[PDB]
Amino acid sequence: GLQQYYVKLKDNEKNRKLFDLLDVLEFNQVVIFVKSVQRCIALAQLLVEQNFPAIAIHRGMPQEERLSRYQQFKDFQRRILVATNLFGRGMDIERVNIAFNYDMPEDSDTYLHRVARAGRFGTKGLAITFVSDENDAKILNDVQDRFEVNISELPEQTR
């Protein structure tokens, strides 16, 4: 179903909110998107230290390396994937039950493509996006105005 929500907070509150949501929310596999390779690597490192089996897969990584790492995610050796973007298919993230946009996507098309992938084939799940500046808010409105998708503040048949 990929229920979509957003949280408006300062960027320096993101780790705090992220950590909070991960213990309170029920989840099997999760994917978290960040805007840069540096943030991708660091966030995964922070999570692992917090005893969260996370792994980073980012642009620049050789096709074979991405798959080896993603394979670990698929076999549940890692339950949290931190990525900079979606890659080809096979990178079937529709398996996740939660998708976080730690950093708001660059634009509304990217945002839709991500929820479409995390919810591919109409699979169920939750989508949570962090809004930290007026640019992020603008994009959020773009998604709602352009696609008429329902995104509210965080408080079989097609899903």
Is 21 within 8 Å of 145 (Cβ atoms)?
A: no
CA atoms within 13 A of residue 76's CA, in its CB half-sphere: 2
Q: Which helix (H) or strand (E) holds 54?
A: strand 54-57
Structure tokens belonging to residue 73: 């995610």
Q: Under DSSP, is residue 35 helix (H, G, I), strand (E, B) or coil?
A: coil
Q: What is the 3-state secondary structure (H, E, C) of 97-117?
A: CEEEECCCCCCHHHHHHHHHH
Q: Pick from 100, 63, 64: which is nearest to 81 by CA?
A: 100
3-state class of 32 per DSSP? strand
Resolution to 1 decimal, in Å? 1.9
Which CATH architecture does the domain made up of 1-159 adopt?
A: 3-Layer(aba) Sandwich (3.40)
| Three-state SS at 135 | helix
Q: Is 70 exposed, middle or buried (0-12, 13-18, 19+ CB in 10 A)?
A: buried
Give the start-to-end residue ranges of the domains of the chain.
1-159
Whether residue 4 contacts residue 151, with contact meaning beta carbons closer than 8 Å, is answered with: yes
**Which residue, 122, 124, 152, 154, is CA-closest to 140?**
152
Helix (DSSP H) and strand (DSSP E) numbers for the chain:
5, 7
Please report the DSSP string for 55-96 in residue order: EEE-TTS-HHHHHHHHHHHHTTS-SEEEESS--STT--GGG-
Query: Which spans in 25-62 are helix H?
Result: 37-49
Residue 137, SS3 per DSSP: helix
Q: CB of 22 within 8 A of CB of 52? A: yes
Question: Using CA atoms, how far apart are residues 43 and 135, in angstroms rounded to an integer?
Answer: 22
What is each CA distance from 62 to 42, 73, 114, 120, 131, in whole angstroms? 19, 17, 22, 25, 31
Phi and psi at residue 136, in whole multiples of 5°? -60, -45
